[PDB]
């Protein structure tokens, strides 16, 4: 049978190869469930004499098959999407002579989540973290998410921790470890018995194992929630078990963060519709924010 040749499944381009002995490691930048990211210098990575600052991502030692496969999966994705201001810029990989190193544009402020909590105790509006800044990050992630979707991709792990921030208040989406290309169906079904970011997951994906374009929309909602609560954990104190699953199904949702404006809560909520086909598309979120 016939398939849309999936760009993110394609064997790998050796044009990204950058010799690892030209890299050097500084302090650790973060670590999620999949990889470890470390700060670095890449000598001669763009200009023959660069000394560029970068983020290098690599498997954590004693990583499993899943972690392994995923790191390659995001090399391949990052590759396919290419430069776009709001996605994380891929600049290289090292696959030869040591562990897979995935080289990324360094974002100097880190994950919104962490950034939010360092600057929560300093939040104001009209000017330091702004309300305009929070709006600005809402716009930029929706903008970037609307871009993935046009490129037939679903992130599958949109969360505050997987959004980076660089200098011009410019935000970059990262962690394409769970991202898949959806052109073939849309309804992408999770095969593995997986270990997933459940509190960011739309009910249809939890219960019926189906992710769609409008299921990143759900997570983007939990992310507007993270954004405007100045970095709170979703459903704080709430373990993921039957009590949590049941409150999602029966349709219960989080309240407005004390710092969210009415229209942003309104978007979140429509992002949280039980009916997948009632949620707005990021394209519509984008335009919903540009009226603010
Ligand atoms: N390009 C980068 N520049 C700066 N920090 C980064 C970069 N990439 C990742 N990080 C940091 O490392 C953390 C883990 O990155 P991520 O790709 O989500 O790894 P994981 O798959 O393990 O979650 C992020 O939340 C962020 O703090
Ligand atoms: Mg992460």
Is 158 in the same domain as 20?
A: no
Is 264 in the same domain as 162?
A: yes
Is 139 in the same domain as 265?
A: yes
Q: Which of 175, 171, 162 is nearest to 141 (CA)?
A: 171
**Ligand 1 pocket, 158 CB below 6 A?**
no
Q: From 59, 86, 106, give the residue that closes a domain.
A: 106
Is the residue at 285 inside a domain? yes
Q: How far is the CA of 126 from the centre of ligand 2 (A)?
A: 30
In this structure, are residues 42 and 50 in contact, taking their beta carbons and an 8 Å threshold? yes
Identify the CATH number of the domain in which residue 269 sits.
1.10.510.10
Phi/psi for 223 (5° steps) reads: -85, -35
What is the domain range of residue 283? 107-289
Q: From 85, 106, 127, give the residue that closes a domain.
A: 106
**Ligand 1 pocket, 285 CB below 6 A?**
no
Q: d(Cα 166, Cα 109) in Å, to the nearest integer?
A: 6
Tell me the sheet residues that pair with 93: 17, 102
Is 129 in the same domain as 270?
A: yes
The tokens describing 46, both together, are 């763009």
Domain count, the chain: 2
**Ligand 1 pocket, 135 CB below 6 A?**
no
Is the residue at 86 inside a domain? yes
The tokens describing 48, both together, are 């023959």
In this structure, are residues 214 and 276 in contact, taking their beta carbons and an 8 Å threshold? yes
Is 49 noted as a catalytic residue in this protein? no
Is 57 in the same domain as 148?
A: no
Q: Which of 55, 72, 54 is nearest to 63 (CA)?
A: 72
Is 81 in the same domain as 161?
A: no
**Ligand 1 pocket, 164 CB below 6 A?**
yes
Tell me the sheet residues that pair with 35: 59
Residue 175 annotated as lining a ligand binding site? yes
Is 254 in the same domain as 116?
A: yes
Q: How far is the CA of 37 from the centre of ligand 2 (A)?
A: 9
Q: Which residues are within 5 Å of ligand 2 (an ion), measured at CB?
A: 32, 161-162, 175
Is the residue at 1 inside a domain? no
Is 168 in the same domain as 241?
A: yes
Is the residue at 101 inside a domain? yes
In this structure, are residues 266 and 138 in contact, taking their beta carbons and an 8 Å threshold? no
Residue from 157, 181, 216, 273 carrying the catalytic annotation: 157
Backbone φ/ψ region at 55: left (φ over 0), alpha (ψ -120 to 50), beta: beta
Q: Can you say how many angstroms the Cα of residue 105 is from the centroid of all Cα atoms in its chain?
A: 15
Residue 161 annotated as lining a ligand binding site? yes
Q: Which of 122, 50, 46 is nearest to 90 (CA)?
A: 46
- Kindly identify the ligand whose nearest atom is closest to the C-alpha of 77: 1
3-state SS string over the chain?
A: CCCCCCHHHCCCCHHHECCHHHEEEEEEEEECCCEEEEEEEECCCCCCCCCEEEEEEEECCCCCHHHHHHHHHHHHHHHHHCCCCCECCEEEEECCCCCCEEEEECCCCCEHHHHHHHCHHHCCCCCCCCHHHHHHHHHHHHHHHHHHHHCCEECCCCCHHHEEECCCCCEEECCCCCCEECCCCCCEECCCCCCCCHHHCCHHHHHCCEECHHHHHHHHHHHHHHHHCCCCCCCCCCCCCHHHHHHHHCCCCCCCCCCCCHHHHHHHHHHCCCCHHHCCCHHHHHHHHCCC
Closest residue by Cα to atom 21, ligand 1, is 34
For 115, half-sphere exposure in the C-beta direction (CA atoms, 13 angstrom radius) is 25
Ligand 1 nearest atom to the CA of residue 105, by list position: 1
Q: d(Cα 67, Cα 60) in Å, to the nearest integer?
A: 8
Q: d(Cα 264, Cα 288) in Å, to the nearest integer?
A: 9
Q: Which of 110, 113, 112 is nearest to 232 (CA)?
A: 113
Is the residue at 6 inside a domain? no
Q: How far is the CA of 162 from the centre of ligand 1 (A)?
A: 6
Q: Which of 123, 104, 115, 165 is nearest to 140 (CA)?
A: 165
For 283, half-sphere exposure in the C-beta direction (CA atoms, 13 angstrom radius) is 6
Is 166 in the same domain as 254?
A: yes
Q: Which of 98, 75, 86 is nearest to 23 (CA)?
A: 98
Which residues have a Cβ under 8 Å from the Cβ of 262 and sit 6 or more positions away? Answer: 256
Q: How was this structure determined?
A: X-ray
Long-range contacts of 117-124, Cβ-Cβ distance < 8 Å, separation of 24 or more: 117/230, 117/231, 119/230, 120/230, 120/231, 123/230, 123/259
Is the residue at 117 inside a domain? yes
CB-based burial label for 43 (10 Å; 0-12, 13-18, 19+) = middle
In this structure, are residues 45 and 92 in contact, taking their beta carbons and an 8 Å threshold? yes
Is the residue at 4 inside a domain? no
Identify the CATH number of the domain in which residue 98 sits.
3.30.200.20
Q: d(Cα 235, Cα 199) in Å, to the nearest integer?
A: 8
Is the residue at 3 inside a domain? no
Orientation of helix 213-228 relative to helix 262-271, angle to 10°: 150
Going by DSSP bridges, is the β-strand pair 52-59/153-154 parallel, antiparallel, or unpaired? unpaired
CB-based burial label for 231 (10 Å; 0-12, 13-18, 19+) = buried
Q: How far is the CA of 87 from the centre of ligand 1 (A)?
A: 12
């Amino acid at each position: 049978n016939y398939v849309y040749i999936d760009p993110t499944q394609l064997p790998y381009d050796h044009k990204w190869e950058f010799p690892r002995n030209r890299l050097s490691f500084g302090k650790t930048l973060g670590a999620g469930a999949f990889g470890k990211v470390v700060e670095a210098t890449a000598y001669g990575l763009i200009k023959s004499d660069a000394a560029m600052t970068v983020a290098v991502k690599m498997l954590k030692p004693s990583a499993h098959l899943t972690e392994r496969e995923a790191l390659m999966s995001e090399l391949k994705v990052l590759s396919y999407l290419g430069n776009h201001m709001n996605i994380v810029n891929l600049l290289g990989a090292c696959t030869i002579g040591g562990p897979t190193l995935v080289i990324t544009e360094y974002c100097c402020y880190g994950d919104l989540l962490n950034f939010l909590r360092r600057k929560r105790d300093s939040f104001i509006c009209s000017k330091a973290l702004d309300l305009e800044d929070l709006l600005s990050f809402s716009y930029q992630v929706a903008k970037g998410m609307a871009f993935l979707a046009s490129k037939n991709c679903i992130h599958r792990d949109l969360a505050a921790r997987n959004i980076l921030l660089t200098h011009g208040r410019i935000t970059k989406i990262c962690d394409f470890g769970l991202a898949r290309d959806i052109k073939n169906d849309s309804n992408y079904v999770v095969k593995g018995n997986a270990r997933l970011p459940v509190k960011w997951m739309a009910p249809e994906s939890i219960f019926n194992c189906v992710y769609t374009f409008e299921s990143d929309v759900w997570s983007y909602g939990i992310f507007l929630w993270e954004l405007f609560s100045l970095g709170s954990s979703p459903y704080p104190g709430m373990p993921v078990d039957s009590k949590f699953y049941k409150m999602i199904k029966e349709g219960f949702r989080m309240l407005s963060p004390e710092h969210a404006p009415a229209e942003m809560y309104d978007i979140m909520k429509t992002c949280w519709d039980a009916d997948p086909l009632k949620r707005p598309t990021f394209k519509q979120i984008v335009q919903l924010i540009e009226k603010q």
